[PDB]
Amino acid sequence: GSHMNPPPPETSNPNKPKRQTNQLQYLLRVVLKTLWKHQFAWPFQQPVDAVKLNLPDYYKIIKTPMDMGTIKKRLENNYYWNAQECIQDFNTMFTNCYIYNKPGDDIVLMAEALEKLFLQKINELPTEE
């Protein structure tokens, strides 16, 4: 893509420690799966392309971008050590949306729908075994 967009967040790095946990499996099989197929998921399924969207200030405002395409790759390629790292990525994605956009904007109502589902599923994150 455009040189004016930053590289996406890291999804592969042999130096980073990684482990499978039952909680991370739940985050893939339940949480990501639930959110990915929601009617309002599509704006969140890949990094923001600030050039295509004509948002030249996006990556000036949002210095820790995150999206569900990145999270999906991190889960499927076993990038994480623990569930907290992945939950933080989802929280970062929502908070970026809420910081960049006006309350009540369509993109914010879409994010809020996904976050409500997220919260319900994370309240049920299984005990680590």
Which tokens is 120 given? 């319900």
Contact pick of 24, 27, 31, 97 for ligand IJX (by CB under 6 A): 97
Residue with tokens 């009540």: 104
- Minimum CB–partner distance for residue 70 and ligand IJX (Å): 12
Q: Is 100 in the site for ligand IJX (CB under 6 A)?
A: yes
**Residue 50, amino acid:** A
Burial label for 32, CB within 10 Å (0-12, 13-18, 19+), is buried
x/- binding map, residues 30-59, to ligand IJX, per CB under 6 A? -------------xx---x----x-x----
Residues in the chain: 129
Residues that bind ligand IJX in the complex, under the rule CB under 6 A: 43-44, 48, 53, 55, 97, 100-101, 107
